[PDB]
Amino acid sequence: QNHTAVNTAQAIILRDLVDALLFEDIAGIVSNSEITKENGQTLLIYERETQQIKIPVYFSALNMFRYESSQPITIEGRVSKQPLTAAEFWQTIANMNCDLSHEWEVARVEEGLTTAATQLAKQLSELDLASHPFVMSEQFASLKDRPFHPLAKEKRGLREADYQVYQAELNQSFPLMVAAVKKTHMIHGDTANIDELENLTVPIKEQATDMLNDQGLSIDDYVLFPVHPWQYQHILPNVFATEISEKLVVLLPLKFGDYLSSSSMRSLIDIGAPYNHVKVPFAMQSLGALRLTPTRYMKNGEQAEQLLRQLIEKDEALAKYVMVCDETAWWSYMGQDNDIFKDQLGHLTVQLRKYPEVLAKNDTQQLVSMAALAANDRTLYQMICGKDNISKNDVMTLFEDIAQVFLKVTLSFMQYGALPELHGQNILLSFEDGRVQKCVLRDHDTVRIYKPWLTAHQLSLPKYVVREDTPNTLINEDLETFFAYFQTLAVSVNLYAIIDAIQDLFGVSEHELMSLLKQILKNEVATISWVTTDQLAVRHILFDKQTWPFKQILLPLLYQRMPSGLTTVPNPMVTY
Ligand SMILES: Nc1ncnc2c1ncn2[C@@H]1O[C@H](COP(=O)(O)O)[C@@H](O)[C@H]1O
Numbered sequence: 001q002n003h004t005a006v007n008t009a010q011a012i013i014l015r016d017l018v019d020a021l022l023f024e025d026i027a028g029i030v031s032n033s034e035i036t037k038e039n040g041q042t043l044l045i046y047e048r049e050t051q052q053i054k055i056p057v058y059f060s061a062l063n064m065f066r067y068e069s070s071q072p073i074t075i076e077g078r079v080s081k082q083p084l085t086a087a088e089f090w091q092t093i094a095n096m097n098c099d100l101s102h103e104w105e106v107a108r109v110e111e112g113l114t115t116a117a118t119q120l121a122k123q124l125s126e127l128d129l130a131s132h133p134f135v136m137s138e139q140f141a142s143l144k145d146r147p148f149h150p151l152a153k154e155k156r157g158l159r160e161a162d163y164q165v166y167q168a169e170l171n172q173s174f175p176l177m178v179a180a181v182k183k184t185h186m187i188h189g190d191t192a193n194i195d196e197l198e199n200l201t202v203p204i205k206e207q208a209t210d211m212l213n214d215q216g217l218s219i220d221d222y223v224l225f226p227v228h229p230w231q232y233q234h235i236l237p238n239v240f241a242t243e244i245s246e247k248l249v250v251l252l253p254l255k256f257g258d259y260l261s262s263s264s265m266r267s268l269i270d271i272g273a274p275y276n277h278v279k280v281p282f283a284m285q286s287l288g289a290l291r292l293t294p295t296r297y298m299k300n301g302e303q304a305e306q307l308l309r310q311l312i313e314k315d316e317a318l319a320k321y322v323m324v325c326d327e328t329a330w331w332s333y334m335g336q337d338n339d340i341f342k343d344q345l346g347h348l349t350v351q352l353r354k355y356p357e358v359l360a361k362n363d364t365q366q367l368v369s370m371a372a373l374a375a376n377d378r379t380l381y382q383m384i385c386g387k388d389n390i391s392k393n394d395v396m397t398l399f400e401d402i403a404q405v406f407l408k409v410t411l412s413f414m415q416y417g418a419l420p421e422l423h424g425q426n427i428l429l430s431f432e433d434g435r436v437q438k439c440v441l442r443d444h445d446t447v448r449i450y451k452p453w454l455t456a457h458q459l460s461l462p463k464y465v466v467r468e469d470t471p472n473t474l475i476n477e478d479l480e481t482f483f484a485y486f487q488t489l490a491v492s493v494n495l496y497a498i499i500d501a502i503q504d505l506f507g508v509s510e511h512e513l514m515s516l517l518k519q520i521l522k523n524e525v526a527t528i529s530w531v532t533t534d535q536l537a538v539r540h541i542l543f544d545k546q547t548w549p550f551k552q553i554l555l556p557l558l559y560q561r562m563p564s565g566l567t568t569v570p571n572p573m574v575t576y
Helices: 003-024 086-095 106-125 133-144 160-166 194-213 229-234 241-245 295-314 316-321 343-347 379-385 392-414 451-456 479-506 510-527 535-544 554-559
Strands: 034-037 042-048 051-059 065-067 174-182 186-188 222-227 249-261 267-270 273-279 322-324 330-333 349-354 366-369 427-432 435-441 547-551 566-570
Touching: 003 051, 003 065, 003 086, 003 106, 003 554, 051 086, 086 106, 106 160, 106 554, 133 273, 133 366, 133 379, 174 194, 174 229, 194 222, 194 249, 194 349, 222 229, 222 249, 222 349, 241 249, 295 316, 295 322, 295 330, 295 343, 295 349, 295 392, 316 322, 316 392, 316 435, 330 343, 343 349, 366 379, 379 392, 379 479, 392 427, 392 435, 392 479, 392 510, 479 510, 479 535, 479 547, 479 566, 510 535
Parallel strands: 322 435
Antiparallel strands: 034 042, 042 051, 051 065, 174 222, 174 249, 186 330, 249 267, 267 273, 273 349, 330 349, 366 427, 427 435, 547 566
């Protein structure tokens, strides 16, 4: 057992837990503590019931307190000289708030923190970096996962053997499996060519044909769907119990191909075609939510991808930098009722993601997800810069370049009333000679829209399949809500996680990196032709307003038996 990897992994889950508690002010850890200073070190004194915690803190570039992770936390009465685990600190906080703990899921958060530390230790210990740079960058994005989130590495439903095979970090390949779906009971994308799906499963077509013939069924009546081996074993026999009885779905115990997981365990990589990914259902619980893409989201992603391509034609900045993944080739089960809203449909789908050909025929450019750059590891920075000897001025110049192209592209989209979900996992940067050449968008199912701006530019609204006269996350009814998903995902999570990584790796101040980010944002907002009636509101929300919205990730996990939530935190752009 690698004891260095266990201690390193335990310290990462503790740091993410304490920071996540401080950002959301869980049990008044900030608001009901006193700021003091013992021997040049700022401390939160959290006193409650009869216990006391001393947290070493520093005022971060988000204008909130963060855990000074170099210094140890002091719990009054704890005589143990060993490092604090995240599970122990959580248990201490829960026992200090007996009134609150009642209505929280204390038991499984404690278990999830233990799992997160165990599985991350495994992945640090047995990290096997792939030879292909894009596959390798996806391993680092998977290793880091959702930043400032202590339960990110917990994958509920996965047994210990499932972690070993499906986690991208360990570099183990696995086959796909087959389910015959009757042609009468399925739909597909408007421009989805069946030839491409047939090409996927063609090696086992003859074996599948024989298996159906030993059952009184004909392959001419069915379409062969790839199924994830976990989805195949644990989910499909139950969710399609009646459909399997009626011979509408047939689970063929076939195995074909050789697939690695990406940053997502749903989007799979064939090493023979590493820019042609296969997305399949994997009904497990990541970040407290059941990882399930409903069939209507793929129909929405088709309408969204269509809008994104119109803005790339229209805008000068988007034409230069932005490319998008083709996700139009998708197939899904469809019950005889023709109710696309049914949750069942999401468990039996297949979606082909074609990355731009320009990249796949360029072996010199390195495709790196912005999630991968948040990983506390030199590998990707040394590859991009082209040297081990990375100076302070090198990485600052590199961050300025990433922040300039990202914030220009993001705000250039937003002026028209369109906002892709731009956390680190959905956007990739094409690096060449240490500079950002291109941005590559993927997962287009959550492109948010502001109708008044789309109407002002005379753009057709995406024909989103949504519940009739009911509010949803896709259509934002005011500018505060529209800019919230930029302020949270793009700046406070994505860009700040890259700042957090660069500080850990190269010792550059996060304050100097935030000043660099702040100035780029001011330059972009000033030079974009906003709808003139709303220009003052854009400036107010970002720069002048005393609060920013913050996406809640811990408090939902305490409430779930998955609630959505924004709360107010201080404006990082404000100096006060
Ligand atoms: N904001 C985020 N930043 C980084 N990684 C994320 C973020 N949100 C989700 N992810 C990860 O990326 C994956 C998203 O793809 P999927 O799980 O297939 O829906 C999940 O497995 C998450 O662990």
